[PDB]
Every structure is written in C-alpha cells, then in structure tokens.
Symmetry: C4
Subunit: 93 residues, 4 copies
Amino acid sequence: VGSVAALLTVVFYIAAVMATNLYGATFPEWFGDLSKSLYTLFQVMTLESWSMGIVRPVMNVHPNAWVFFIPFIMLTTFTVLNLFIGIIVDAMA
Amino acid sequence: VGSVAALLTVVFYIAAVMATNLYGATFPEWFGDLSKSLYTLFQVMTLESWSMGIVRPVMNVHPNAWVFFIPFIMLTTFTVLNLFIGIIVDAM
Amino acid sequence: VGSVAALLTVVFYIAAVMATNLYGATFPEWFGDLSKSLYTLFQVMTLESWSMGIVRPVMNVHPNAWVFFIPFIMLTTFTVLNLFIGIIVDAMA
Amino acid sequence: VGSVAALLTVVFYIAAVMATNLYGATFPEWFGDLSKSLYTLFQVMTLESWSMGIVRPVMNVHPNAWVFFIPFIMLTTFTVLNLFIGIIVDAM
Ligand SMILES: [Br-]
Ligand SMILES: [Br-]
Ligand code: NA
Ligand code: NA
Ligand code: NA
Ligand code: NA
Ligand code: NA
C-alpha cells in the first residue's frame, strides 16, 4: 500500500514537471508553474472539465496533447482506485 | 482479463467508426474523423460534458442520439470498471 | 442481482414521473415530458452538470429542489454501484 | 459501518461551518450560509464543477483555497467510497 502511494507521488511530480515545460508558455493560468500544474493535474485526475475545460483548448495549440493526458488519466485514475481499494482490504484484520 | 481488454478495444473502434458515420457531417469538431471520434468517445466514457457539452447539442440535430450514447456509456463505463477490478483481483 | 435491477427501474420511472410533474412547466427542455425527464435523471445519475447545469437553475425557481435530487443521487449512485459489483461477484464460479 | 457514517456527518458539518466562515462574504451564492455551504460541499464531493465552477473562482480571491478543498475532496471522496463498500460487504 505504501509502495503504491510512493509510485503515485513520483509519477504526479514528474507529470507536473513535464506539463509545466510543455504547456506553461501557451496556457500559463493552467500550467504556468509546477504549483499551477499539480493543481491542474489533480483536477484532470478527478476528471473535472478535463476535455472541454482543459485538453480541448490545449490540443487546439498542441494537436497531440492527448498523448500526455489520456495515458496520464489512464494511470492515475487506476492507481488511486487501486490504492484506495488497497487500504480497504488491509483494514480487515 | 486479457479477453476483457480485447472486447473493449473492438467495441471502442466499432463505436468510433459508427459515431464518425452518424455525427461527423453535422458535428465535425467532435466526430469529423475516426481520431476525433475515439478522443470524444473516451471523453464520453470518462463522462466529461457528455450531455451538456456533447449529447444535448448532438440530439438537437439527431433526436435519438441517446440510443447510441446511453448504451455506449452503460457498456464501457461497466467493462472498464470490470477490467480494472479484474487486474486487482488477479494481482493477489 | 435481478431483484436490484428491477428496484432501480421502478425507482427510475417513478422519479422521472415525479420530476415531470414538479419541474416540467418551469424547465420544459429538461423535464417537459417523461422521456426528457428519464434522459435528464440518467445525466443527473452520471453526475454530468447536475448542479451548475441542472439543480442550481432549478433551485432558483424551486428553492427546495435539492430534497428530490440529493436523495435521488444518493440512492441511484449507490444502487448502480451495488448492482455492478453484484454482477462481478456472481460471475466467479 | 455506523461509525463511518457518523464520522462523515461530523466532518461534513464542520467543513460546511469552516467554508461558510472562509468564503461566505466573497462568494455568498456558494457559501453564504451553512445550508448553501452543505449543498456546495456535496456538489464538490460529487466533483461537479469543483474547479472551473467553484475552486478556481474561489482561489482567485483566496489563493490558498486548495488547502481546504483538495484534502476535503481526498477525505470525503474516500470515506463515502469506504462506507458504500462497507454496506456491500456487511450485506453478505
Ligand atoms: Br479510464
Ligand atoms: Br454520493
Ligand atoms: Na464538468
Ligand atoms: Na465523473
Ligand atoms: Na464527473
Ligand atoms: Na465524476
Ligand atoms: Na463534470
């Protein structure tokens, strides 16, 4: 369980570093700095306006932005689910 | 588990082929080509603006568009859940 | 499992009948007829624009519309989850 | 199971008291009174327009509003899930 939580944090920071680099200059309110990026990627992970609100406006400038977000969503919005189930199963003793 | 992942892919491509045909000419930014369609159907599967953003504007032109999306959502947003649980159970 | 699916259908139709009556005259594009209502309540069950898109505009005219939707969300967005888990557990033999 | 449901209610009312205090004067339609706050925090817990609709407009006035909502979302959108699974397991 602790190994899963460590994997997600390392993945979250690297993704937020990557996103700052890629879309910070063109979408500064969303990826302008690591802090803005970590907040956006959490919102993207929770799926709130991920497409209409974020990815569609982003993809308009970066046609292939989906190569980052779609797998990023597939990984985190699976790992979080796996982690949360992991705590629940471990709780029974 | 591998059988489930294969079923979802085949279903996803056929649905995206179908949607391109049905709503590509009237909603090209959303279903204009297979690529645009696969991206939209993933967004529809995650449920982001599926109604207000997609299905409601679509249904305005195609009154019965719900006959495609509602079952499509019912299938994928069940199979993905079944697949993800399938990996978790198999891991132990 | 079959008993759960029957309970949800009966609940869905009665809720959609109730909603047509309550908010059909003031919000016809959303609850104007049983068909429009069943489509809206599914969208509300999936949680797409349930508040900003539906309940907030509705509550503006019917201040207590939350007494219908909040429990309706609590019931269906629990029963569907319980039904889907029910099929998964029953599949193993 | 009953202990979990009690923990969530106590957490929900305290969070809604806190939010009324913090953002009621600047965002009254959203946190103007405990009732408005409890309705908003449920909508935030379901994740409907939590960022674009609520937290982003809020953070514009309170730059650190994320210190409240992100953990609030992390707690409730875990406890509800844990509670719902708890009823399902106890049913057998
Ligand atoms: Br997914
Ligand atoms: Br809920
Ligand atoms: Na949304
Ligand atoms: Na969702
Ligand atoms: Na959502
Ligand atoms: Na959601
Ligand atoms: Na949404």
